[PDB]
Ligand binder design. Structure first.
Ligand SMILES: C=C1/C(=C\C=C2/CCC[C@]3(C)[C@@H]([C@H](C)/C=C/C=C/C(O)(CC)CC)CC[C@@H]23)C[C@@H](O)C[C@@H]1O
Length: 253
């Protein structure tokens, strides 16, 4: 059976599409306002050098901070999000923030050269730029693998925004008070996505896609954990906090 999207489901999708268009600039016209990217000579990928300089940390910290502000705006527009207590809202935003950033970044990721291209050469981020920000291959390599796998699913924008919404409203986040409400909200998003795929998504791969999408959410949890480990070590570097921003410090600190 392939039931049609209900009126409510169509409206949910329309709201999510609109929320993403208001919170995701595909021209990347605000990036010049961030602290400029600085790329030093580190051909050897020296952990010591990278840690002593962190030349890309200020720029990427601003990009991530800017993105967190956009994700918050996006979340507030998710049907049902505002019915939760602010306490539960904060908990969900903090624990999913980096996952949504990795998800939403897929839009700027290109398989031409395995990089995130955001306009001109100055705003093209490769593996080497991330190591210059203080992170190691243990997080970077799986991150790239994740980006390629997500790209290959060739998701419609409707499925892309539904996945980010589902990612944010997870009942199994450490610290949630009303897990039942959150689960109710997530199920409504999940059924919408499942219905949309069977309904609007053409073959090959008509089915299976949902499972593949749910699996990516699991993958994210792992990246979340690894990023968290590396951020901690990174905060051990003296004078590091000044290279970040208050928002990043509170969300990952
Ligand atoms: C943000 C974006 C973005 C790209 C994302 C990138 C490319 C550079 C390295 C990033 C930022 C990784 C990287 C491992 C995370 C780095 C974060 C560093 C910190 O640990 C702070 C969390 C130190 C500053 C995660 C996503 C990825 C560009 C646009 O698509 C909008 C999106 O919305």
């Amino acid at each position: 059976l392939r039931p049609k999207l209900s009126e409510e489901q169509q409206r949910i999708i329309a709201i999510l599409l609109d929320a993403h268009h208001k919170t995701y600039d595909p021209t990347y016209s605000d990036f010049c306002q961030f602290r400029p990217p600085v790329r030093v000579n580190d051909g050897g990928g020296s952990v010591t050098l990278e840690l002593s300089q962190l030349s890309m940390l200020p720029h990427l910290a601003d990009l991530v901070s800017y993105s967190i502000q956009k994700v918050i705006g996006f979340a507030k527009m998710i049907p049902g999000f505002r019915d939760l207590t602010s306490e539960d809202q904060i908990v969900l935003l903090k624990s999913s923030a980096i996952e949504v950033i990795m998800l939403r970044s897929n839009e700027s990721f290109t398989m031409d050269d395995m990089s995130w291209t955001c306009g001109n050469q100055d705003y093209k981020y490769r593996v080497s730029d991330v190591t210059k920000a203080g992170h190691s291959l243990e997080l970077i390599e799986p991150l790239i693998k994740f980006q390629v796998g997500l790209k290959k699913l060739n998701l419609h924008e409707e499925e892309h925004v539904l996945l980010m919404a589902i990612c944010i409203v997870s009942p199994d986040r450490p610290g949630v008070q009303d897990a039942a409400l959150i689960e109710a909200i997530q199920d409504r998003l999940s059924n919408t996505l499942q219905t949309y795929i069977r309904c609007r998504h053409p073959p090959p791969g008509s089915h299976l896609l949902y499972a593949k999408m749910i699996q990516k959410l699991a993958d994210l949890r792992s990246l979340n954990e690894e990023h968290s480990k590396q951020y901690r070590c990174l905060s051990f570097q003296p004078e590091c906090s000044m290279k970040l921003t208050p928002l990043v410090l509170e969300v990952f600190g």
